[PDB]
Every structure is written in C-alpha cells, then in structure tokens.
Design an enzyme around this catalytic site. Structure first.
Site, PDB file in Angstrom:
ATOM      1  CE1 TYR A 121      -7.368  -8.113  70.854  1.00  0.00           C
ATOM      2  CE2 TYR A 121      -6.697  -9.454  69.354  1.00  0.00           C
ATOM      3  CZ  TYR A 121      -6.709  -8.417  70.133  1.00  0.00           C
ATOM      4  OH  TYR A 121      -5.044  -7.255  70.620  1.00  0.00           O
ATOM      5  CG  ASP A 153      -1.876  -6.541  73.328  1.00  0.00           C
ATOM      6  OD1 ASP A 153      -2.152  -5.702  74.100  1.00  0.00           O
ATOM      7  OD2 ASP A 153      -1.959  -7.412  72.689  1.00  0.00           O
ATOM      8  CG  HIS A 161       0.632  -0.917  72.284  1.00  0.00           C
ATOM      9  ND1 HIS A 161      -0.086  -1.439  73.446  1.00  0.00           N
ATOM     10  CD2 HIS A 161       0.771  -2.728  72.025  1.00  0.00           C
ATOM     11  CE1 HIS A 161      -0.534  -2.835  73.012  1.00  0.00           C
ATOM     12  NE2 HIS A 161       0.355  -3.880  72.394  1.00  0.00           N
TER      13      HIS A 161
HETATM   14  C1  LIG Z   1      -3.058  -2.589  71.051  1.00  0.00           C
HETATM   15  C2  LIG Z   1      -1.940  -1.004  70.188  1.00  0.00           C
HETATM   16  C3  LIG Z   1      -2.130  -0.566  72.010  1.00  0.00           C
HETATM   17  C4  LIG Z   1      -1.780   0.702  71.666  1.00  0.00           C
HETATM   18  C5  LIG Z   1      -1.689   1.510  70.059  1.00  0.00           C
HETATM   19  C6  LIG Z   1      -0.883   2.474  70.453  1.00  0.00           C
HETATM   20  C7  LIG Z   1      -0.503   3.250  69.878  1.00  0.00           C
HETATM   21  N1  LIG Z   1       0.278   2.439  68.776  1.00  0.00           N
HETATM   22  C8  LIG Z   1       0.157   1.442  68.146  1.00  0.00           C
HETATM   23  O1  LIG Z   1      -0.338   0.221  67.140  1.00  0.00           O
HETATM   24  C9  LIG Z   1      -0.835   0.659  69.306  1.00  0.00           C
HETATM   25  C10 LIG Z   1      -1.573  -0.645  69.470  1.00  0.00           C
HETATM   26  C1  LIG Z   2      -5.065   1.079  67.682  1.00  0.00           C
HETATM   27  C2  LIG Z   2      -5.195  -0.208  67.104  1.00  0.00           C
HETATM   28  C3  LIG Z   2      -5.545  -0.282  66.260  1.00  0.00           C
HETATM   29  C4  LIG Z   2      -4.706  -1.461  64.730  1.00  0.00           C
HETATM   30  C5  LIG Z   2      -4.664  -2.227  65.536  1.00  0.00           C
HETATM   31  C6  LIG Z   2      -4.522  -3.233  64.130  1.00  0.00           C
HETATM   32  C7  LIG Z   2      -3.506  -4.387  65.222  1.00  0.00           C
HETATM   33  N1  LIG Z   2      -3.327  -4.376  66.526  1.00  0.00           N
HETATM   34  C8  LIG Z   2      -3.572  -3.243  67.272  1.00  0.00           C
HETATM   35  O1  LIG Z   2      -2.404  -3.659  68.397  1.00  0.00           O
HETATM   36  C9  LIG Z   2      -3.990  -2.465  67.063  1.00  0.00           C
HETATM   37  C10 LIG Z   2      -4.375  -0.937  67.735  1.00  0.00           C
END
Ligand SMILES: Cc1ccc2cc[nH]c(=O)c2c1
Ligand SMILES: Cc1ccc2cc[nH]c(=O)c2c1
Ligand SMILES: Cc1ccc2cc[nH]c(=O)c2c1
Ligand SMILES: Cc1ccc2cc[nH]c(=O)c2c1
Ligand SMILES: Cc1ccc2cc[nH]c(=O)c2c1
Ligand SMILES: Cc1ccc2cc[nH]c(=O)c2c1
Ligand SMILES: Cc1ccc2cc[nH]c(=O)c2c1
Ligand SMILES: Cc1ccc2cc[nH]c(=O)c2c1
Lengths: 537, 537
Positions: B456, B329, B514
């Site tokens: 970010y 990540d 992820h």
């Molecule tokens: C950053 C990020 C990227 C992918 C996913 C996929 C599934 N769920 C997650 O929370 C997530 C968070």
């Molecule tokens: C898709 C998705 C949506 C929310 C979040 C919130 C916090 N962190 C993540 O990695 C993430 C990924």
C-alpha cells in the site's frame, strides 16, 4: 578492449526478419513496390508504429491503424488481412542458431551480453508462439531491453545511453550488432564497435575479427546445462519421515527423470532444458537416499516395492494421474518395475543402460548374480558400513574416480576396495568441470552413502516381489537405450527384453560409457525427444 | 461400537458397475442370457479373471483370454470386440457422489475409511481415465486395498483378515459395504456389520441406522480443502535476495493464484483441489512479503512494476511461456497490470472483487483515493510501523477480527487503529476453524506485516507506472467477479471496466463479503471452472 556484446532480435537473433515479409507480400501480390513498407513506417516518430514500439498501444490496437495507413498509401499510388500477414511472419521467424551460438561463446569467455530490440506488447490470440521464442532466447543473455517496456526506440539517442548504463560499460568496450544501418549509427557516434548484419556468416566473421574469439567453424557445442540456484525446487512429503525433492522445468506432459547410483537430479542437467524446450514438464528427482530427499538409515526402506509405492505417492500428492518415467542405472531398474506394477500411472517408460531383468524363480538371486561376473563389485556393497567408509572418506576423490569416460578408467573387488590401486588425486574427466564435481561433493555431505548403498541391499526382498510379475508383459510404450562401452550394463544383457516387452523401441549410443547423460548428452536428447514425440504425446 | 467403514468400488463408490454392461451388451445384442457373464466368470478361482484380479496378468493380456472364453460359451449354447465393450464400460463409470459424500462425513466424524476392491493392472492405451478416477477417489480414504496389488481376492477369507489388520480394528468395529452378496458373506462370518448395496438411498439409510450419524438429506458440503503438509511446495529464486514459494497441484494449463492482503497461498485452499480436478496445473503463490516467500524490508521492493517483473521471472525460471493469472484484492490489482504490461505471458486474467483501476493523469493518486472514502482505512497503513505494531500485537486477534462474513463485522480510522472498539478475544467466524486461523498465525510469525503493508506504500510510483498504459486496452480473455457484500471493493466500482476491457466476461456472487474464496467457495469454483473451460483452454 571489448567486454560486452549487444544483439538486435529481428534479422539478427531471429530469421527471417518480420520486415522481409512486407517486401515479399508486395511481390507475391504484385503491389506497387514499398507500399506496405510505407504504410508500416507512416508518421515517422509520431505514427502508429512508433506508438506500438514505445508501448503506448498493443499489437491488437495497432492492426486497424496499419490497415488505415495501407488504404491511404494505396490511394496516393492509385492502385486481404494485415493480421494474417503478421501472424504468418511472426510464426515463421525462428532463432538464428549460429548467431545464438556466437552470443553463447562470447558470454562463456566473460562477455556481458544483451538483446536490444524494437518490439511490441503482443496481445494477439496467437501471442504464445512469440512468448516461447523470447523465453528460449532471453535465458542465454545477461540483459533483454525491449523498446515497449522502456518507452524508447532505436534510433533515439537515449536508448543507447540507457544500454551503456545497463551494461555498466563505456562505449569502446561494447560491440553492437544490428541489421538496420540507421539503428547502428547512434552506437557508432558514441564510439561502440558496430556490425551491420546482412548474412550471418559475414557478421560472425566481423565479430570474430573484433573480439579475437573463434566463433565460426567451432566444434559442436554441448546442450544447455542447469544452474541449480536458478531452478524451481519442489518438495513432497510421501510419508511421515520421507520427503522427495525434485527440480521442475517446462509445461506439457509430465516426464519424471530417475537417476542412478551414486548420482543426483543434476545428472540430468543436459536433459532438463532440452526436454522442457521440446514441450514437456520435466520433474528431475533426487531419488530416496540422495541430495535434498530424505535418507532413512534402514535397509528395507530401499527395497523396490517401497521405492515404487513412494513414487506413486509422489504422483498422488502432485495431482498427476500419470508421468512418463525415464531412468538410468538403478533409476532404470525402478522405472521398468513402475511399468510392471503401476501401468495405470506410467504414460510411457524408457531406460538408459539398464535392461529389464526379470526374477529367475528357479535360482536364488545370489546364485543368479554370481553367474554374471561384471556385478562382482556389488558384493562389496553388501556389508553395511564397508563401502560407506571408503566412498565417504574423500568425496572429491570418489566422484572424480567414478565419473569418467570408457577410456579414462582408474578403477576385481577382493583387492579390498574400489580405490585400492587408484590415484589419491585423480585427474578431471573430459566429461566434467571441477565445479560440477564440487556440486556432487556438496550434495553427498548431507547423507553420504548409506541410503544410496541400501538400494543394493534388498536382493532377496526384490526377488520375492519381482516373482509376482512373472506372468506379466510390459505392454505400455517402452524404450531401451543401450550404451556401447558400458562394461557392466552391456548392450547384450538387453537381448531378451522383446520376450517381455514385445512392442519395445530401441536406441543405441556408440562410444558411450556408463554415465550416459553427461557422456553423450546431445545423442541422449535426440533419442529421448524423438521417442517422446512419437510415443508419449 | 463402529469405528471404521469399508466400501467396495464397482457398484458402490462408482456407477454404473462395470458388470451391468455384460447384461446390457447381452440384451442390446440379443445374445443368450448370462453368456457374457458366464465367459467372464469361467474357471472360477482357477480361470483367467481370477488371475487378472490377483495381478498375475494385466488387462491387456486378459482381453484375448476372455474372447476365447466367449467363443466356448457361445459353442455350448449353440449361437464384435471385448476390448470395445470394456473400454466403454470403464469410461462410463463415474464416482457415486452421494456414496463418496457419506464416506467423507464418516471420516470427518472420526471413522477410519477404506476402499476394498477386486481390480486389475490396467495397461490399456486408455488407462488414464481409470487412473484419474482412482486418484480422485483414493485421496478421501485412509486406505485403498486392491486385489491385484495384494494378490488376494474377495471372497477369499485372507483378504478380510488382511483388511482387519490394515484397519487395526476388531470385526465388530467395522461396517462393510458391497454390492455382491457373496463378497459380503466372509465379512458377516467374522462379525462385521454388512450392507448389501443395491440402490444408494437404501444403502445410506442402512448406513445411517448402524452408525447413528446423519448421512442422507445433509446440508451441501464445502469443496475439498488442502492439508499444507500433504501439498507439493515449490521455491524459485527470482533475484539474489528474493525467493517465491508456491503450492502446486494438478496437470494441464498453468493457473497462477495470487492472494490479497493480509493473506496466504492457503486462502485458495478450497480452489486448489477443484481447479486441479477440473484439468488445470494450479500454482498457488505466497506473494512477495508473505509466508515462505521472501519479505525484504524496503518499501520500493513492493511497487507494482517490481512485483510484476518478479512474477514474469517466476514464469521464466519455471519454464512457463504463459499462465492464467487469477487474483483477489491486491493480487487482483497485480493480475490486471500483468495483463496490461505482459499480455504475451498471460493466457487469461480473472479478478475476484478488485476492479481494474486506471490511473487518472489529471489527479494526484492521493486526491483520487480521498474521493473514494471506503479506502480511508488505507491512510492508516501509510506511516511505517504504525499498522505493523497493531496487527502484529496479537496475531490470533488480528486474523479472527479480519476474516469474518459481511454480517459478522467487529471493525473510520481516526479512532486510532483498526481494533480500537473491537473485542480483544473475538468469536470464531462461521467461515473458519480455529486450526485455519492458527495456520495464518504461524505463517505471519516469520515476517509479520511490514512486507504486506508495503504493498500500500507505493501509490505515487504505481501511479507513474500505470500512466504508461493509458492508451492501452486489455484484449486478452478476462473475467471480473463481483461480490455483493464487499463494502470496500463494491460491485459498482467495476462499472467502467468494459471501456478498457471490451470483451470482459463477468461473474457475480450474492451475499458474499470481502473474503470471497472462503465465504462462497462452491460458487467461486463453479464460476472459475466454467470460465477457464470456455476462455483459457
Ligand atoms: C479490505 C477489506 C475490504 C472489505 C471488507 C469488508 C468486510 N470486512 C473486512 O474486513 C474487509 C476488508
Ligand atoms: C475496512 C478495513 C479496515 C481495516 C482493515 C485492516 C486490515 N486489512 C483490511 O483489509 C482492512 C479493511
Ligand atoms: C543385477 C542383476 C542382474 C542379473 C540378475 C539375473 C538374475 N537374477 C537377479 O536377481 C539378477 C540381478
Ligand atoms: C565397476 C564398478 C566398480 C566400482 C563401483 C563403485 C561405485 N559405483 C559404481 O557404480 C561402481 C562400478
Ligand atoms: C528386480 C531386480 C533386478 C535386478 C536386481 C539386481 C541386483 N539387485 C536387485 O535387487 C535387483 C532387483
Ligand atoms: C556401475 C558402473 C557400470 C559401468 C561402469 C563403466 C565404467 N566405469 C564405471 O565407473 C562404471 C560403473
Ligand atoms: C485504490 C484506488 C482506488 C481508486 C483510485 C482512483 C484513482 N486513482 C488511484 O490511484 C486509485 C487507487
Ligand atoms: C495501479 C493501482 C490501482 C489502484 C491503487 C490503489 C491504491 N494504491 C495503489 O498503489 C494502486 C495502484
């Protein structure tokens, strides 16, 4: 008035210059003169080399561009690997020791120092050699300005204003050393003192003339020391109430340094950088009872069996199957017993001053100790609280009184203490600075002397344990380093060691007292590195 | 009722037994049957072997004594190196994986486990091989009782009472496994459950029958994890207000693990022991803003240029000229840029999920990000304090909601938050235990989410910096690991990487979301170890 000194890398802090290879290759291969130096410089501020130096491209991308420039220059003149030439040039380039020593002396006298260099992003398979050189050099300077990181090159005027801004100094306060006249010119224009470096001796003569500081013909400098706040500090819990702290530096085989009484990891301050530079991963302990390591109050927590088991646990938790163990004073006795009880975990063993002493099964350890009167002072350590009271009473006095060379002594023990007819305000030994004494004072404020003194309070338990090893020999690689002027751990006390350690190697330091590491640091370093390289991988 | 399990080493936890070499050597050399097994056993409880096993003498002292016993036995029978035979026997002996897995399952179910072994003090030049084997094995047991350390051997009755006292258990509560019937007998006499081990399968059949716990035909176990309190914790100050914490395990080339958002060094818990066992020195970071590392509040403290410079300083202070950098990540984006800006310091680079993403010089990074809608959720992270408020509100809810497999999702972002139509009390993912979630909760109580979110908040600064690298290629060893079911960092996003990294190697994990490291730990370990061994030394 001068306040800062700036040095170039190629041809100034490092020799031979990566340039004086293009000229040598030309001569060795009988090519037209300057041809390779031409191809290297092609396009000027627009060419491949300027792009490399500004960080636009990496060295590996530049190699085929230089090759193409070489064929064009050969074609013009009407007349083999660039990679091989540069690989050899980079690996032959070594630190210019007298130039580094002059930069070190100027910084010690309050100068701000910097390296300003036209360099590249090295992605060659052999890049580690240069990474190692830069890492050793940069530590000794306040600033390192690399062309490929700032996207500017010498002689462009902006790199000089950037340098001045980085130093927070006006041009007249700066002395600037370079081997290229063209790169020296913009510094001169701004009003900086400049030195054209050809031979090192003349450059330093010019440098001492402008600074008014002696740089040439100086006494031999001490090895690099450690600044506690700049080290990596490690902490391992070996059992619920006990954690061990250590300072860690370098890569390679693990070398575990074990100090004596009443010391610190910092007693190895002159050894840590040298051993790491020599290719070893140094782990300098705070032994149980000291500094940031736990100090339980119970006497039995400090018997040799417990101390050794915990050092084995320390290795287990760090994921180390072995370490070389190097000890001094009590640490030296611990390392001999590590070799005897845990040979599988000890890559090699070395002791400074402390001989290997077996148990005499036909004599009580109290009878045995009294037959060697130099240890009479250890009887004073037996009664719990007596020596703690005297030693904790004034820490500065304690450390300044103890840490002295053989001819600086200020210290019988039925006088009623170690400091009975000793000064209340001793002078500072030539071995230590006031700042180093205050480091020990600060460390000992946490737990004081109970835990450290407990190392002497387990004679009977240690004798019983040591008796289990009477039929053994130490057959792993071993070094015994004697110190001429240690009046307690005398060299003659090690005379029987070959009977127990037949393959034993030795070292001996003349005019060296008890505090070996800080008394004769250069000699200690030379002896340990030579032995590690031959017997410990 | 059984509460403890005791295992022998030779022939039980490790195969082939160092014994079934004496019989093989006899057959291979056509010697009279049992001759070498005779010479090994000579004198019984009075002979050289019993002395070795009790720790009276070391293995190197025993070698010439066994040689002498061999000539005497050959003389009686009327009919070459002992060192070579034992060296080969010891190095061929490997951990009996199904037996270790059964010991692991019993401990997981509440059993106290121990290794009870007749062993020696190994001082051979090749002792490290055995040290490595014992170190890997012992970590998985509550106790390791070695004959040469306790001065008692099986079948002597006192070693069994010592064992019972160590376990704090009555004989009926103990199951005892051994391959030697004679060493099993005293355990049987005391009332312990005993298992004569010949073939592993039958021994485990007997073991599952007595314990009532399934040990044979079980699902594939997860790799070994980390217990935070048992790790070596390191701390390096990289600048006055910033220190970096890391967990460290193993010896060999340095491998620096860089986690993502919002994670911890602990996200690598299944990788750390495996990589250390594979021959690497693992340094698992708490990245800036996380866990025990400093978390300054300023957004600009988290731009890529600053983060990379500090990781270079981290290496400098530890005395490391290079490290392999492995990231996931945000950590994966940092490692690609470490390779681009500091190739000299990066031995090799690998990323899990995160592709290398160059700057588009003809498009604003805000325009560019909006052209990839899977990142819309990152816009919610921009406004300072908004996402901090939601994520810090209930840490247990935050971590349980985030750390879920691809089919367990409970989470558009103009709904007004990440948890708008999400459960207030989510179920526990099959990937994590309640204890693991509480570890993250505890870590995030110190600094919360400001520093992590700031990673970010530097798009514009990062784009300007990344633009300096547009003419470069990554030419050092590189691995890109894609995860089939990561719906944000999709495998297709890495499709152009070969244009920038021509020699790029790949790995791919099917049915992986992820949270790669805890989703598919065995697969991650297999991929990383294979690549490290081939491309990183
Ligand atoms: C950053 C990020 C990227 C992918 C996913 C996929 C599934 N769920 C997650 O929370 C997530 C968070
Ligand atoms: C898709 C998705 C949506 C929310 C979040 C919130 C916090 N962190 C993540 O990695 C993430 C990924
Ligand atoms: C420090 C010390 C020094 C010498 C001996 C000699 C024999 N026995 C000992 O216990 C002993 C202890
Ligand atoms: C000869 C002598 C006398 C006193 C002391 C006191 C503390 N520590 C020592 O090492 C020592 C050595
Ligand atoms: C093994 C060993 C050797 C010497 C000594 C000296 C003094 N005290 C000890 O405990 C001791 C222990
Ligand atoms: C333990 C010990 C041993 C030797 C010496 C020699 C000189 N001075 C000391 O303080 C000292 C302390
Ligand atoms: C996360 C992320 C992903 C894709 C891109 C594409 C182009 N430019 C960016 O800044 C960017 C940032
Ligand atoms: C270098 C680089 C690449 C992608 C991204 C994505 C989002 N944000 C960034 O700052 C960023 C920076």
């Amino acid at each position: 008035t001068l306040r800062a000194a700036v040095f170039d890398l190629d041809g100034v802090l490092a020799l031979p210059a990566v340039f004086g290879v293009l000229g040598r290759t030309e001569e060795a291969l009988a090519l037209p003169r300057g041809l390779l130096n031409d191809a290297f410089q092609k396009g000027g501020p627009e060419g491949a080399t300027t792009r490399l130096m500004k960080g636009e491209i990496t060295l590996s991308q530049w190699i085929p561009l230089m090759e193409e420039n070489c064929r064009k220059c050969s074609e013009t003149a009407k007349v083999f690997s660039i990679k091989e030439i540069f690989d050899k040039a980079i690996s032959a380039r070594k630190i210019n020791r007298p130039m580094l020593q002059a930069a070190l002396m100027l910084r010690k006298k309050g100068f701000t120092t910097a390296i300003l260099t036209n360099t590249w992003l090295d992605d060659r398979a052999e890049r580690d050699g240069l990474a190692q050189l830069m890492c050793e050099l940069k530590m000794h300077f306040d600033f390192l300005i690399e062309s490929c990181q700032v996207g500017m090159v010498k002689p462009e005027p902006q790199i000089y204003k950037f340098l001045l801004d980085t130093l927070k100094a006006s041009p007249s306060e700066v002395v600037f050393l370079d081997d290229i006249g063209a790169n020296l010119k913009p510094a001169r224009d701004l009003g900086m003192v400049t030195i054209l470096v050809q031979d090192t001796d003349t450059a330093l003569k010019e440098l001492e003339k402008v600074t008014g500081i002696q740089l040439l013909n100086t006494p031999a400098p001490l090895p690099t020391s450690c600044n506690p706040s700049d080290m990596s500090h490690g902490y391992v819990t070996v059992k619920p109430r006990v954690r061990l702290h250590f300072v860690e530096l370098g890569s390679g085989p693990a070398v575990c340094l074990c100090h004596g009484f009443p010391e610190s990891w910092y007693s190895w301050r002159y050894q840590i950088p040298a051993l790491a530079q020599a290719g070893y991963r140094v782990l300098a302990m705070d032994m149980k009872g000291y500094g940031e390591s736990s100090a339980p109050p119970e006497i039995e927590e400090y018997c040799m069996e417990v101390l050794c088991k915990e050092m084995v646990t320390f290795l287990d938790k760090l994921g180390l199957s072995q370490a070389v163990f190097i000890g001094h004073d009590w640490g030296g006795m611990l390392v001999w017993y590590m070799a005897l009880f845990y040979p599988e975990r000890v890559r090699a063993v070395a002791s400074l001053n402390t001989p290997f002493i077996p148990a005499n099964p036909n004599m009580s350890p109290l009878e045995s100790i009294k037959a060697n009167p130099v240890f009479d002072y250890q009887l004073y350590f037996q009664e719990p609280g007596v020596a703690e009271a005297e030693l904790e009473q004034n820490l500065s006095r304690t450390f300044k009184s103890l840490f002295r060379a053989s001819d600086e002594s200020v210290l019988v023990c039925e006088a009623g203490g170690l400091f009975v007819n000793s000064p209340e305000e001793p002078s500072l030994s030539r071995m230590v600075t006031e700042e180093e004494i205050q480091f020990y004072v600060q460390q000992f404020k946490k737990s004081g002397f109970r835990g450290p003194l407990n190392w002497y309070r387990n004679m009977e338990r240690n004798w019983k344990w040591a008796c289990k090893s009477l039929g053994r020999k130490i057959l792993i690689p071993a070094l015994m380093v004697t110190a001429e002027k240690d009046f307690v751990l005398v060299p003659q006390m090690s005379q029987h060691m070959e009977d127990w350690i037949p393959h034993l190697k030795r070292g001996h330091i003349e005019d060296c007292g008890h505090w070996t590491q800080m008394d004769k640091p250069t000699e200690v370093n030379q002896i340990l590195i030579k032995w590690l390289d031959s017997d410990a991988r």
